Amino acid sequence: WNGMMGELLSGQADMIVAPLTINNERAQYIEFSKPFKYQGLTILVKKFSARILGMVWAGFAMIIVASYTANLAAFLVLITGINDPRLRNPSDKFIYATVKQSSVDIYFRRQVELSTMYRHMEKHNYESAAEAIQAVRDNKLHAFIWDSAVLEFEASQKCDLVTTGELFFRSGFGIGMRKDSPWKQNVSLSILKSHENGFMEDLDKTWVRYQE
Amino acid sequence: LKKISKSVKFTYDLYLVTNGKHGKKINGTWNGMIGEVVMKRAYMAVGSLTINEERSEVVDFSVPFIETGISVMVSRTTSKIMVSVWAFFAVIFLASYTANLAAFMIQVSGLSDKKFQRPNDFSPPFRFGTVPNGSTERNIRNNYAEMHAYMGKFNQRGVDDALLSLKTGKLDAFIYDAAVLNYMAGRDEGCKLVTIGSGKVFASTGYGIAIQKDSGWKRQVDLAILQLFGDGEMEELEALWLTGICH
Amino acid sequence: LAAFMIQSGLSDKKFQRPNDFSPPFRFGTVPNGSTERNIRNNYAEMHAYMGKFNQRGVDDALLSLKTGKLDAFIYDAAVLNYMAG
Ligand SMILES: *[C@@H]1O[C@H](CO)[C@@H](O[C@@H]2O[C@H](CO)[C@@H](O)[C@H](O)[C@H]2NC(C)=O)[C@H](O)[C@H]1NC(C)=O
Ligand SMILES: *[C@@H]1O[C@H](CO)[C@@H](O[C@@H]2O[C@H](CO)[C@@H](O)[C@H](O)[C@H]2NC(C)=O)[C@H](O)[C@H]1NC(C)=O
């Protein structure tokens, strides 16, 4: 292993506090508490005979202007998640990328039905979410599979940032721990006691709820 | 449960509780599904059990498989040329107004509401209550004493009774579990009854499975649930049971 | 006004008489197939006309049709439905 789990199992760390993606590999090696986050996965995208003729021509002018009004009114009035076929078999145009050595890549590798996607994201994996956001802001990217809350805060920050529709794999973020330790029961009880009252709403007022 | 017994290979048999509904520590004694598991007359309780700190000290709850909360539901020659130019400009303005018109044609605060924190304290007396002896009633008493005291005269006894009383106008707002009131909203006759906002949840928690204290199965019981989300069986199952009609 | 705002086949004359109209038409199919066999046994002259418009693959017919080098392509029904979608 490497990263946060590589450091925690080496003993150099004691308790991982971060947006930790709860999955099946981690639960076998290390312990968790109740997740403090609720969200799924989505995509970030960027955004007197003459008198008879005279009256007849007056009627003609009226019908012509009515038709012009009708046509001007008609002129002035009249991807979607993973289920995009153009992303089922992508090309060099639609560029969807994800973070290298992140939990999402392992999650997509688990389901071999998205092997071609695993064979496409491998060529454009970026180290950090900031790199992907900057590259897609330069319109060098076209899609970015990532968490919902982070991309929502980013869309609040940057008005050109837009999300898709599908909300799938509704997991949570929790606190990674060491193995069975008395730093578990009271920790999970504290997390639950924080969730029950208005503390989470206050923290959202601080960072999550606010818009830019 | 059918999915559960398949992979851990344990046998079982069901029966229905006779005393209590969901659990109430009366004189220090718990009843319902929780009360039996404390008495160990049963080893597992499955149903609609709300995870909270108070109930987590007598039993153990496995990882929740569905997210819910507490919600409230309510019932839904140059001069002549210049004049001609002005008339043309007015027709243009008129056209813009019409086209724009056709285009446009083609195109409560919450629990802490003033009417809630000050119920029956406004020109129009308001009304709202909930079913007693439940987890939601316990939460209200421990965070808003006066608000809990007000609801004592609007206590219901069932989901249907609250829906009908709300339909008849005898009640103005009904507070109950978030997960089930979502089900009734999408399956009511018409779409007359709705929840506050686009779906707002207070005090997020989960539904859990009650197990006898310090069981040796809790390691294996929850590990199966995590396998369900990773593979994705809940999506099909929830569409089978929890889908709705109204949008 | 508001309501208004809210609002042949194989035996075609151009087919049975190909290149017999002011605008010469063009159409062909892949040889050595079941479809080619059926045409020769029901319309000899129509089969004879297509000899100069014979293709060699599904993609080639689609691109040639896109480029305008061909006007109509005759092939199996099941697969051409797949390519259309
Ligand atoms: C909560 O529990 C109490 C006690 O069991 C219920 O009160 C009973 O209500 C029934 C029906 O009206 C009476 O016959 C009993 O005599 C009552 N007992 C007592 C001691 O009050 C109450 O109805 C329950 N509320 C709900 C529906 O949860
Ligand atoms: C149909 O079959 C004939 C005969 O095999 C093909 O004609 C051959 O084409 C290749 C490639 O040009 C030549 O090397 C052979 O000498 C040709 N043989 C004869 C006898 O014509 C023809 O191309 C095939 N057509 C298709 C694609 O169905």
What are the main properties of this structure?
part of a larger assembly, 3 chains, A: 212 residues, alpha+beta, five-stranded mixed β-sheet, two-stranded antiparallel ribbon, 14% strand, B: 247 residues, three-stranded antiparallel β-sheet, 10 helices, binds a molecule of 2 linked components (NAG-NAG), Glutamate receptor ionotropic, NMDA 2B (chain C)
Describe it.
The structure is cut from a larger assembly and holds 1 copy of chain A (212 residues) and 2 copies of chain B. Chain A is 48% helix and 14% strand. Chain A is of the alpha+beta class and 212 residues long. In chain A, the strands form 2 sheets. In chain A, strands 2, 3, 4, 5 and 6 form a 5-stranded mixed beta sheet that branches. In chain A, strands 1-7 form a two-stranded antiparallel sheet. Chain A starts with a helix and ends with a helix. Chain A is elongated, with a radius of gyration of 28 Å. With 247 residues, chain B is α+β, with helices and mostly antiparallel strands. Helix content of chain B is 42%, strand content 12%. Chain B has helices at 2-8, 32-39, 78-106, 114-117, 135-141, 145-150, 159-168, 178-187, 218-231, 233-241; strands at 44-45, 60-61, 67-75, 128-129, 173-177, 193-195, 202-206, 210-211. Chains in contact: A-B, A-C. Chains A and B meet through helix 3, strand 6 and helix 9 of A and helix 3, strand 7 and helix 9 of B. It is classed as transport protein. The entry lists the keywords NMDA, antibody, transport protein. Native GluN1/GluN2B in complex with 5F11 Fab (class 4), glycine and glutamate-bound state.
